[PDB]
């Protein structure tokens, strides 16, 4: 029983612990969100197929790691799926050929919120898997651990809806112009969606956000968001109605606003957070 990565590198077995680097491609789905499919990433074979058959099984206690350690879901494994983290021992994979075949494993995540997700950085631990290898000749019972690491920066969706971008930068023209914000939302299944903005406001109605510009800031002005002519104050919920697999635009537009008194030239910058909720 030996394994190698999609790039041909061999995966060591039976050390203190083995670290495997894979590419993630999360996608939102109905019921279960996909984290990483390992069938395209890990390949294993058997160098003595005529005289020994190798059995590999996923042991109990396998779970997510790192920033995903507190999440739960399911695991695809050889023709069926089981709850994750594993509370029992999974059935066996059989390796009886010298030809590399995929390790049929994929990890899923149970949605917990409306949109929202945890950001994964390259080289961060994703899951700790416990494997038990046995054979039909020896009576040996060998346990080893694989540590799954990401080699690309992605964001795992923790909810049932996703967005076009997690960070959006827009550029207003010089005072007093305005620009639209290209932000859209879609959900794997029909849902009632609404969002509310957040940040440090600077007025009574709390619709105007403070100028955060670090270098040569302009004073007496702030940033105020509006959708289709209506003004959205912070900490107030805006409803979108039913949303589905077809992307729905939020329709937000960013404008300059005047507060306090005399306005002085300089730079303007605000950072506004958008949050989603069910209805």
């Amino acid at each position, epitope marked *: 029983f030996a394994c190698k990565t999609a790039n041909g590198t061999a995966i060591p077995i039976g050390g203190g612990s083995a670290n495997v680097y894979v590419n993630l491609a999360p996608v939102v789905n109905v019921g279960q969100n996909l984290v990483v499919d390992l069938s395209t990433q890990i390949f294993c074979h058997n160098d003595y197929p005529e005289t020994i058959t190798d059995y590999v099984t996923l042991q109990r206690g396998s779970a997510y790691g790192g920033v995903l350690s507190n999440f739960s879901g399911t695991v*695809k494994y*050889s023709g*069926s*799926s*089981y709850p994750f983290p594993t509370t029992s021992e999974t059935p066996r994979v059989v390796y009886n050929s010298r030809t590399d075949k995929p390790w049929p494993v994929a990890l899923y995540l149970t949605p917990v919120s409306s949109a929202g997700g945890v950001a994964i950085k390259a080289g961060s631990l994703i899951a700790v898997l416990i494997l038990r290898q046995t054979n039909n000749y020896n009576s040996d019972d060998f346990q080893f651990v694989w540590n799954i690491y990401a080699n690309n920066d992605v964001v795992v969706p923790t909810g049932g809806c996703d967005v076009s971008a997690r960070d959006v930068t827009v550029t207003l023209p010089d005072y007093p112009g305005s620009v639209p914000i290209p932000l859209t939302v879609y959900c794997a299944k029909s849902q009632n969606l609404g969002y509310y903005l957040s940040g440090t406001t600077a007025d009574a109605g709390n619709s105007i956000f403070t100028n955060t510009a670090s270098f040569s800031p302009a004073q007496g002005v702030g940033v105020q968001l509006t959708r289709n002519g209506t003004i959205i104050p912070a900490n107030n919920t805006v409803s979108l109605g039913a949303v589905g697999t077809s992307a729905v635009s939020l329709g937000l537009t960013a404008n300059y606003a005047r507060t306090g008194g005399q306005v002085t030239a300089g730079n303007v910058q605000s950072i506004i957070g958008v949050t989603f909720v069910y209805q």
Partner: antibody, heavy 117, light 108 residues
Framework: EIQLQQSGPERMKPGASVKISCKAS????????IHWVKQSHGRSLEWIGYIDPFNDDTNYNQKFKGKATLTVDKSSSTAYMHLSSLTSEDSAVYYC??????????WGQGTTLTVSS | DIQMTQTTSSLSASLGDRVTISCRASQGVNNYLNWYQQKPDGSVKLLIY???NLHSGAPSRFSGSGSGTDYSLTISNLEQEDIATYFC?????????FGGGTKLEIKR
């Protein structure tokens, strides 16, 4: 809610080929495996294989490896069972099923295949 | 591959009786055994999975238990709905295999 709808009965000449379909509805198609089962006239159940609808990897019974072919269509959420070089021994009922916890918890109604000259 | 054997092919019972159907495996399976029911017309339904877990929607009168290489299915009390065929299936190793089937009938 969860159900699988298969194609109707098929009649083929010996040596021909047939392609059964199995339309799934009521759940996320790509997150579960699909298995196929054969029931002969003696009503004994035979396992053919499974396919992963996400990446389309398959696993065949050596009894059927050279004759059966499983394929998927993610857009329409449909699974296919292709059988070649039909003989009289291939006349049977074929079922598609969804697998969870290693159980095949949901089944289609089955398709009757008749191979006769 | 792993062979499955159900002790009897036909079982005679009476309404309200307690019946038990046994299955045996040629080698150990880590409780990965399933039970199915097939109606006379041909419809197939899952009853119990992982030796003791009953499917969502099945009658509460079905129960299963067992350990390595020996399993059984029990019906607390028979109803006319329960006259059908029953199969045991292992999922510990590929290829998945089924039992021979056991068919119930009313004694008279």
């Amino acid at each position: 809610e969860i159900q699988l709808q298969q194609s109707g009965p098929e009649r083929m000449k010996p040596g021909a080929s047939v392609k059964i379909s199995c339309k799934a509805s009521g759940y996320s198609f790509t997150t579960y495996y699909i298995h196929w089962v054969k029931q002969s006239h003696g009503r004994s159940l035979e396992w053919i294989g499974y396919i992963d609808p996400f990446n389309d990897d398959t696993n065949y019974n050596q009894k059927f490896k050279g004759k059966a072919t499983l394929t998927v269509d993610k857009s329409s959420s449909t699974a296919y069972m292709h059988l070649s070089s039909l003989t009289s021994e291939d006349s049977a009922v074929y079922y598609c099923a969804r697998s969870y916890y290693g159980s095949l918890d949901y089944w289609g109604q089955g398709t009757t295949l008749t191979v006769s000259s | 591959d792993i062979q499955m054997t159900q002790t009897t092919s036909s079982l005679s019972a009476s309404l309200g009786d307690r019946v038990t159907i046994s299955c045996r495996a040629s080698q150990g399976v880590n409780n990965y055994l399933n039970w199915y029911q097939q109606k006379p017309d041909g419809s197939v339904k899952l009853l119990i999975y992982y030796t003791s877990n009953l499917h969502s929607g099945a009658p509460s009168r079905f129960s299963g238990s067992g350990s390595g290489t020996d399993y059984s299915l029990t019906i607390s009390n028979l109803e006319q709905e329960d006259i059908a065929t029953y199969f045991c299936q292992q999922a510990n190793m590929v290829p998945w295999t089924f039992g021979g089937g056991t068919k119930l009938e009313i004694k008279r």
